[PDB]
Symmetry: C4
Subunit: 325 residues, 4 copies
Amino acid sequence: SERVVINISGLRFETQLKTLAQFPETLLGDPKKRMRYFDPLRNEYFFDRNRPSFDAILYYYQSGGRLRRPVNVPLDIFSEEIRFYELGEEAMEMFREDEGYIEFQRQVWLLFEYPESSGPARIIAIVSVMVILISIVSFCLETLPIFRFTDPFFIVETLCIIWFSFEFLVRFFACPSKFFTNIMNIIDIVAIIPYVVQIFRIMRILRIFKLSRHSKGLQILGQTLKASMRELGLLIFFLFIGVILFSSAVYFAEADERDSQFPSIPDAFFWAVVTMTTVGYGDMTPTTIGGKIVGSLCAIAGVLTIALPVPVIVSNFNYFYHRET
Amino acid sequence: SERVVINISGLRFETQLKTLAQFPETLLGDPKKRMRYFDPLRNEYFFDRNRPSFDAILYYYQSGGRLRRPVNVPLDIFSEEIRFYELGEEAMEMFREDEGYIEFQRQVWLLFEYPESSGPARIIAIVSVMVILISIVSFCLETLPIFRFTDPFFIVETLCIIWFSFEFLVRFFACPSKFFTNIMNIIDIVAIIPYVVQIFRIMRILRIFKLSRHSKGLQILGQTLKASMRELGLLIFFLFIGVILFSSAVYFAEADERDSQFPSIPDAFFWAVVTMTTVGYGDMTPTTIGGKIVGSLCAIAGVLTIALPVPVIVSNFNYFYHRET
Amino acid sequence: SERVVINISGLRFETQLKTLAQFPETLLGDPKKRMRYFDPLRNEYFFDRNRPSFDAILYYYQSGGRLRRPVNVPLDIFSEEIRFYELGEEAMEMFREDEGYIEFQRQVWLLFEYPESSGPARIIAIVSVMVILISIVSFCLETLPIFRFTDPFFIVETLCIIWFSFEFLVRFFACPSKFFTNIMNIIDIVAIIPYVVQIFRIMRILRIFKLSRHSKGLQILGQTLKASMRELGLLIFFLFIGVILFSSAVYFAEADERDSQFPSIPDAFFWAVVTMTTVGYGDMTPTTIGGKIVGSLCAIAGVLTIALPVPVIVSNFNYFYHRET
Amino acid sequence: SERVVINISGLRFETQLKTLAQFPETLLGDPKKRMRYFDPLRNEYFFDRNRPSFDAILYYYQSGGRLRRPVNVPLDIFSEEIRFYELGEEAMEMFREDEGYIEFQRQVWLLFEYPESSGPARIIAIVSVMVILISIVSFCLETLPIFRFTDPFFIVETLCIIWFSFEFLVRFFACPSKFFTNIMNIIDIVAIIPYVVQIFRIMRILRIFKLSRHSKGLQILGQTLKASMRELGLLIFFLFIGVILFSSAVYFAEADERDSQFPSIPDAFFWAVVTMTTVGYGDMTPTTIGGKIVGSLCAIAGVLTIALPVPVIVSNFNYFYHRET
Ligand SMILES: [K+]
Ligand SMILES: [K+]
Ligand SMILES: [O]
């Protein structure tokens, strides 16, 4: 119950000794630690330090754990005062968590997993990207009407696979731990499985995801979509409810019309999709006065359905964008 | 007029005793309550508590009712100080209102109205959703050109009605009070009235609203639209003024043209709607130099007309979204 | 130079007497006014009032005019403290301006200019709106292919003019001052000038603006557009620069093509407009590889050109919207 | 170690003399400078000045360089206190940088480079703009089907070049320094190089950029795009990844269809572009159930791809817009 006066650059703080003794590990909790700052003429402990920060420090003793940075104190200045008062590593990491902060194969694992290290590391990454870009150009040219080791496309297709196999064999016996959690390598597995044929071709387009390893923004978008599936799927659900709603509204408004462009419900789905997203079908346009109305409400409700979950998904992207800079 | 000194962890507060006696129910208003905190050596009442919060507490006595949380004090910390100073339940609920905060049938009413309680409660809700989803699929398949108890659709249509009647008979004699205010049950009434035929079919599509009971976001959007009708209808009115304006501007610009695609005013309405919402008609495009101009101004003014009331409606949605989490 | 101590509910303020005597009209500047608050035991002036507000009050004496409300003090509380310290009507109105705040014919001028006064005032406004809405419906029906005092439209056209003349003759000899500045009456003049015929018809559509007097949001949008012409016209200029830019880019990319859909520069203007506003022409689509590219860049740059000046115009609207509530 | 008490209008500040002596150039660091403010009755230095500002001033001595304006202190008031305490020109310019702040030919260089100086300076700028606007109108009329010194267009084309040469010869021997860094003159060079012919015509359209010198907003947009290329190019990259992704998804979904509108991968690129930007092709619309799905996901992912990097680019524009006012 013994009173303790703490002078912070002229700002007076008073408390009970039992409140500071609650945490015997810190500065003000250890009598031998705070001894060097005692003023025997005023019976107080003087500190020639920042003043707005000490409101939360002394409250960390009163509350017995709570360490909230004041809204007017900078983040770096308050964090450097916690080091001086020695509140503890447990309370320091809780402050960051509350603020928002989470030989034979060692050299080959430097110019491949972290291509920003050495000199040849930054060049072998460009060559690996050129193989990917040509791998994408090769996939887009295997279908032209002109074009539809001897096969003129089997010379570059395998050449990229030889490099895409060279981007996997050097990463299995040189990785830290034996790997399937990192999605960067799951893409390397789906880019190297051309051993049902159409499903493997739709699976073959996943070689575009090979750029995510070497791209700055692709990593940011990947974290955004994962950290937004609730509001990301909320759009898909809100659009599903509206498509079923408005495709049926235009169908009953254009049912007695012998030349009504909407024959059934599912045939009016794609019309409601491009009218909500405001893309524009060009084909199925309404003809009935009531059907024309339904199209107007389908375009108005479309902008609302889209623009509601977007700011949340935009905010998740702008956070990871700035945090990675 | 007797002066009273209040020491808050070193922060000095002075007032007149009549100001604290204005509220005899609280701590500082009751002399017997504040007796335990008096310091007879300094003639003051000491409190080893939070310091930035007491500005508003002592002002609650001076203003005689006003209790405004300081902008730099957290919401939980300030609210816990009101409990200590015992300002009263009337002033506490006014603070929340000012901040923004509003046997035979008892067990059957748990696995139906609150399907998150028991184990079988969370399974009977999934079965009830599967019936709804099949009920929606059934409505969309009763119109295909191929398909247009013996009727192949009368086997699932009634089967869902048997379940949709099973989702109403168990809720009338098991509800708390006899019900028409909760819109969740008005949908159950409009999903069970298939006892003018086309109007009942347009009324039949309202079975999609049955998902609002089991959906998280549908409840949020429903509250959003109700709490936004002024700005929601402001869009409909702003778009009505512009459609009448620009449909007449393109009609007089394309009147002497014998092959002008716009014959009258109402026939140019749907063109102005999809050009403001930027959907794209594909059919009626302008042909005259002046009519081409009108279409350009109709698309520019459309983005403005849409994007003005949207942020308000988005803010109403993002509030109910986060408040329900 | 005589020192003056001012005690604000325990918060100590010191200054020189010449600083308070700088404004002899206020409380602390008048010795007879502040006499009632002097404490002859401490040699200070005590005030049992708000504490965070007095930082700016005492600075109003030091700065000699500046009166800035603190960011943590509410607007109503700080404004009520200026009344107590009696800083003057000149400094009070400067604070509002700095914060953001600007018989025979007397009874007939109440149920017409302010239709919210009496009972019959709120009914005669509805009848005046029904005449306007029918006046708009009449204008839209004078052009149907079926329809294209004896003239079936001359019975309602003049009947609304009789009312639109009844909404002008009662406002010239009953107005406060003889009127042309208020744009509400300029619309009444352009709705009553049907005494070159096509220009008067395009001028006749301005009868839709008659709703601005009785509409809540139309007044808000009118103030928004006037308070945004710089950024409103900035869009028109940014779109003008892009239309000329991209219409020429697609024309040179599709010049050697004998069947290029773009014959000249001005014939590609409307394509660039609906591709920037993302409306969709449906007619003129690019055919050349380079022309296809130009269309892609014209759609990307369109969203940027639109979305830059929009938030400013949206902010001007959301300010007048909330300020009128 | 000698203690120093600083009284700021009643607010008490204490520190060690060695902390103020750390900067011997300032007021409180120079004993002769602060001598005029010493109170020999209280042993303190009194200042009749602003109170919330001195937290950062005294911390500038403790931190030994850091000068951060408090979040509640206005920018002008805090900056005027730094002048009084005389912290130094080095710390003052660091505060602005931390806040966000960077005869025979002398008279001819006033009515040309700064056309806001004299009277004839503001008129010769309008004539120079009329030549540019006619130069733009001339370029748009050299291609009409009607029109496709004797050449009817060689009379205005050279007349503008004579003026565009008059806007370069007077700026080379009258400029401050001999010029290629300022992009305003690089446009004057690309507007005066009509001395491969089609490439010079696509290079000739760059005469629209001549308006950037005399336009307020064109300068703001130019700074915006340069200060946004990372997020500006991030859109181009995000759209490139999606176009390749969805053009291949619709091609494999519409491959067995003999009348599939998408013959190859590159022929489906422009469809994915206008469906992501929601422009609307009107030509290539999907026909297969799977292809219809791909178009729906291509329109949903398009709004997301567009709306993510837009707020960053909008914020860069709104900063330069307000900073230039
Ligand atoms: K469109
Ligand atoms: K659109
Ligand atoms: O379209």
